[PDB]
Amino acid sequence: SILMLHDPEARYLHKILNLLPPEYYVEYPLWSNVVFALANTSANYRPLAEWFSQKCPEKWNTGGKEKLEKLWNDASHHTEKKITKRSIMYWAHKHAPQQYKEIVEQGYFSILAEYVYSYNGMLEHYMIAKVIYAMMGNKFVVDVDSNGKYVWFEFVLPGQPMNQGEIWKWRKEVNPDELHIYISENFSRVMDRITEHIKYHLSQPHESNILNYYKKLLKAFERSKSKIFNDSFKKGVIRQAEFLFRQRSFIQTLDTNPHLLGVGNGVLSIETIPAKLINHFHEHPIHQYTHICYVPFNPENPWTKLLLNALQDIIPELDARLWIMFYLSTAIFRGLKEALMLLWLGGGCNGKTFLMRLVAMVLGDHYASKLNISLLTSCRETAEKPNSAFMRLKGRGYGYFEETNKSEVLNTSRLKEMVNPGDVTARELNQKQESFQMTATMVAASNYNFIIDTTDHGTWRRLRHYRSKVKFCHNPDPSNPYEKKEDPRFIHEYIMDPDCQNAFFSILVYFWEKLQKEYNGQIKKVFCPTIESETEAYRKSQDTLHRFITERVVEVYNLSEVVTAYAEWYNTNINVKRHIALELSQELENSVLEKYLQWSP
């Protein structure tokens, strides 16, 4: 009340909070959240925080000063993720209609009347922009992009035309059409209020010059009233309001929190266990989304049983099934992950494409996409205008590769450009140079083997492998438990079906929360004898020197002709490669070949 004279917006907030039909505050538990909203949002209101506490129906006034005792102690509070006054704006708006609305138009009319009175009934772009920003300031936001071009974002609400599944989220608009419709529809009511106010004053008894002044004002306002609908005037008003709606540091703070997923029925939160769905008002800056509705995991659903049976069919090994599901569970999380990546091959009709594609299109194009094999096949790095395919992983958490023409040797150098959870820079199509954040669960499956071509620690630790065990053929001959019939309905349909995708998403989130509760969070804790044994068998293979030791080494010599024997060991039987390893390769010289123990030239 000391600062009551200043900031009529304080009066506006007071009248807004006066329309709380039930006892909203109760006590500070379950309601301190709103208190924090006021505290953090109402910064300048350090004394008005205590003043509102005094006004709180269950507080110091009712002897409940201990309720705020845990609330004014953190006066500065060093605020974390912030609640906004728009949250306060939301209730007493969608909880107690009228009254609140009436004071809202009262404030609008006050501002517009002040502007009209000050400048003798002449209206320009900036005045309308101020009124509009004070009139719809909680639904639109403007921020300059990387290319130096401003963009418009609008919060979506139920009951209005929209694309499918973009509810409770922020949409990008090249032009705020709804803003034009609004300024051409709702603002005319305020202008009519101004006109009737002028008429009411005109009807009152006054001196002759007062009536002449009011007649001149009415004529000027009538002249200026039709300007609110002209195209150029509206465009200029939008251009002026552009500056008012600008909010610094918005685009770079969009879709940054990896614990929130944009789904078709709101936003999915995985901060706690169990994961909760926010299908109501919020304030998180979420723009990217997938069109998959989220439902709690339930095995009783027929599609869930069908999918579980399908996973059993594809992966006979229970431990391999569990490990694969746990690894795929990390696709939803868009944060930093352990440096793991696997491959798995097999014969035709194995079922790779079904599972990989289903995961890819259930995570959505925004969070997952298919990437070309040449992105890592090509060892040559791009200098200017890097790969736009290399830019497909921006924000994406999943990517799969199915393209191999016979055996292929990978770079083993650009792997750490994609496996290390660190940073890497890439320049987009004709816009600017930027940097990445390596957060993506990548997979690669196709026929034929992969040539690692190297024997080093690291890349070997940061890699896994698997092989198929079931084949589908139209001849399901008996005595072959690994041979099963085909279900072309699985690939041609059953994927475009939304219900199957929803069931798979439920299974995936259940597996993610299972990996969350047990094994802590790390993935290098689950025990899988099959996968580890297969990976160490792949370790034994592709290591030519080890096979040479195993079968050629029995029970001058200082690499003078040992290098020639090595270049004949594998570079003759198999075409030929440049074997530059020599005494320079002291690890090879001191490998198991050193069992001769001949350290003498």
Ligand X SMILES: Nc1ncnc2c1ncn2[C@@H]1O[C@H](COP(=O)(O)OP(=O)(O)NP(=O)(O)O)[C@@H](O)[C@H]1O
Annotated binding site: 310, 313, 349-354, 402, 447, 461-462, 472, 486-487, 490-491
Residue pair 373/445 in contact (Cβ under 8 Å)? The answer is: no
Is 380 or 474 the residue whose CB approaches Mg ion more closely?
474
Residue 407 binds which of ligand X, its own copies, Mg ion, none (CB < 5-8 A, kind-dependent): its own copies
Q: Residues at the annotated binding site for ADP?
A: 310, 313, 349-354, 447, 461-462, 472, 486-487, 490-491
Residue 91: C-alpha distances to residues 42, 105, 134, 552 (Å): 17, 17, 18, 81
Provide the sign of the torsion angle of the four alpha carbons 66, 72, 77, 81, taken in this order.
positive
Tell me how far apart the alpha carbons of residues 147 and 138 are, in angstroms, rounded to a whole number.
Answer: 26
Is 266 or 351 the residue whose CB approaches Mg ion more closely?
351
Is 337 or 352 the residue whose CB approaches ligand X more closely?
352
Backbone angles phi, psi at 501, to 5 degrees: -65, -40
The two three-digit tokens of residue 175, written as one number: 């032009």
Cα radius of gyration (the chain): 34
The two three-digit tokens of residue 291, written as one number: 């069109």
Is 454 an interacting residue with respect to its own copies (CB under 8 A)? yes
Kindly state the smallest distance separating residue 477's Cβ from its own copies, in Å.
16
Tell me how far apart the alpha carbons of residues 401 and 386 are, in angstroms, rounded to a whole number.
Answer: 19
Residue span 469-488 as binding mask against ligand X, x where in contact by CB under 6 A, dash where not: ---x-----------xxxxx
Provide the sign of the torsion angle of the four alpha carbons 260, 261, 263, 268, taken in this order.
negative
Is 314 an interacting residue with respect to ligand X (CB under 6 A)? yes
Is 4 or 584 the residue whose CB approaches its own copies more closely?
584
Is 40 an interacting residue with respect to its own copies (CB under 8 A)? no
Residue pair 256/153 in contact (Cβ under 8 Å)? The answer is: no
Kindly state the smallest distance separating residue 490's Cβ from ligand X, in Å.
3
Is 449 an interacting residue with respect to its own copies (CB under 8 A)? yes
Please identify which residue in 32, 195, 585, 591 interacts with its own copies, judged by CB under 8 A: 585
Please identify which residue in 118, 378, 407, 564 interacts with its own copies, judged by CB under 8 A: 407
Kindly state the smallest distance separating residue 363's Cβ from ligand X, in Å.
18
Residue 310 binds which of ligand X, Mg ion, its own copies, none (CB < 5-8 A, kind-dependent): ligand X
Is 400 an interacting residue with respect to ligand X (CB under 6 A)? no
Is 580 an interacting residue with respect to its own copies (CB under 8 A)? yes
Kindly state the smallest distance separating residue 403's Cβ from ligand X, in Å.
11
Q: Residues at the annotated binding site for Mg(2+)?
A: 350, 352-353, 402
HSE-CB at 390 with a 13 A cutoff on CA atoms is: 27
Please identify which residue in 60, 109, 126, 354 interacts with ligand X, judged by CB under 6 A: 354
Q: Please choose, out of 27-35, 99-107, 207-215, 448-456, the segment that lies near its own copies by the rule CB under 8 A.
A: 448-456
Is 329 an interacting residue with respect to ligand X (CB under 6 A)? no
Tell me how far apart the alpha carbons of residues 458 and 132 are, in angstroms, rounded to a whole number.
Answer: 59
Is 58 or 487 the residue whose CB approaches ligand X more closely?
487
Binding site for Mg ion (CB under 5 A): 353
Burial 82-95 (b: 16+ CB within 10 A, else e): ebebbbbbbbbbee
Residue 111 binds which of Mg ion, its own copies, ligand X, none (CB < 5-8 A, kind-dependent): none
Tell the residue number behind the tokens 């023409």, with chain if given: 405
Q: Which residues in 397-532 belong to E strands, given as ranges?
A: 398-401, 408-409, 425-427, 433-435, 441-444, 450-451, 464-467, 471-472, 483-484
Residue 382 per-residue DSSP state: P
CA–centroid distance for 440 within its chain: 12
Is 32 an interacting residue with respect to its own copies (CB under 8 A)? no
Is 351 an interacting residue with respect to ligand X (CB under 6 A)? yes
Tell me how far apart the alpha carbons of residues 73 and 85 are, in angstroms, rounded to a whole number.
Answer: 21
Residues found near its own copies in the complex (CB under 8 A):
336, 338, 406-407, 421, 447, 449, 451, 454, 456, 492, 580, 584-585
Residues found near ligand X in the complex (CB under 6 A):
310, 313-314, 348-354, 472, 484-488, 490-491
